[PDB]
From a paper:
DING is a family of proteins with molecular mass of approximately 40 kDa, with a conserved N-terminal sequence of DINGGG. DING proteins are one of three families within a superfamily of bacterial phosphate-binding proteins. To date, the crystal structures of two DING proteins, i.e. human phosphate-binding protein (HPBP) and DING protein from Pseudomonas fluorescens SBW25 (PflDING), have been reported. In both structures, a phosphate ion was captured in a binding cleft between two domains.
In the present study, HPBP with a single mutation was unexpectedly crystallized during a crystallization trial of a certain protein–RNA complex, as was the case for the first crystal of HPBP. We attempted to crystallize a protein complex composed of proteins of 53 kDa, 52 kDa and 11 kDa in complex with its substrate. After crystallization trials and optimization, small crystals were obtained, and a high-resolution X-ray diffraction dataset (1.35 Å resolution) was collected. The crystal belonged to space group C2 with unit-cell parameters a = 94.3 Å, b = 87.1 Å, c = 88.6 Å, β = 90.82°. However, the calculated asymmetric unit (727644 Å3) was too small to locate any of the components. The results of SDS-PAGE of these crystals indicated a protein with a molecular mass of approximately 40 kDa that corresponded to none of the target proteins. To identify the observed protein, it was digested with trypsin and the resultant fragments were analysed by LC-MS. Mascot search of the obtained molecular masses suggested HPBP, a member of the DING protein family, as a candidate. Surprisingly, HPBP (space group C2221, a = 96.3 Å, b = 86.8 Å, c = 89.9 Å) was identified again. Taken together, it is plausible that HPBP was a contaminant in the BSA used for substrate preparation.
Residue numbers in the entry: 1 to 376
Write the structure that this text describes.
Amino acid sequence: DINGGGATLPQKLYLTPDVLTAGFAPYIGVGSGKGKIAFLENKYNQFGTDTTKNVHWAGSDSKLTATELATYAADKEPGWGKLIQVPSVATSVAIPFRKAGANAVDLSVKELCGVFSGRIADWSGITGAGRSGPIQVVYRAESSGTTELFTRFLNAKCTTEPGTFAVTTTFANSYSLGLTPLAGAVAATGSDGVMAALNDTTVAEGRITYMSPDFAAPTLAGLDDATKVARVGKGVVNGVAVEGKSPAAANVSAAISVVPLPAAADRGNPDVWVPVFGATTGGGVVAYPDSGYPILGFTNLIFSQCYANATQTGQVRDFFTKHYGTSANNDAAIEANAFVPLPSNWKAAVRASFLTASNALSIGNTNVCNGKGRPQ
């Protein structure tokens, strides 16, 4: 079997029949931090107890760090080939909450920032929401790509809190003044563990969190129910009151469509393949959009260019052919699970480097992978 796992944000997508193609074992959702370790160190123990199995790929919504990349290049690349890091799909980060009320909850960015810094501790501080009583933040206990995507937004946009939010996979380490300002914030493990805490009816109402849109509501329609999933983006633009948007994929697709391709000359560097959003556009960073739903990013795949086993090599190529295909692809499934397909130019770029046989970066390239590859 080809063994993969990691990020929980897209786990239900990868578990959907026929999204992963022939030869792939069922995806094991354990978090992006564990997915990166599993791949980089070939440690199946991050996925399960059968450590005779080898790891072949990971899902991650946390980018590979400079240290991770350099260590793999020195330790693993000579025998296993280059690693490949590519976007899989684009995603919003949803803000589901448990607090009854007929009114739409529509967070301004300033309000969102105050909720997650602890400055706003009561629902009455959310204008127009018609709710009052304590807010309780639920967050991911472990190294999480959802946390990275979310804190990247807070770092860029929460610019008038007492403290500042650092970009991190560990939410408890983000705010400069710590979690102490929050009263009774609750940590849970996995997208599912956080949603279970959010939905726990044995505690008082008031909980709020950040979440994969595939987990944030039971169906796509539920993402548009602003009594359960917050709109974000409420404000005033050119003198006129604007409403925020739901985290439905339709509200981030336009912004995703104009994300620049990775710089051609540097496409051998896995770091350039995953765009990150930031306050301002420039130097590889893409500005968070001023229209549509504001909190977005990419979730990614990590693969090897080379596999020791030729059948596995072919099966990996078949998966890339589908997932990045012009047609006969996974786009319908991607949308059904609340995500945004990659734009056509992005699919073409991924194919041109990693599929097209003549390219030096292509999976299973006979010249590059001659006598090399990850173990089967």
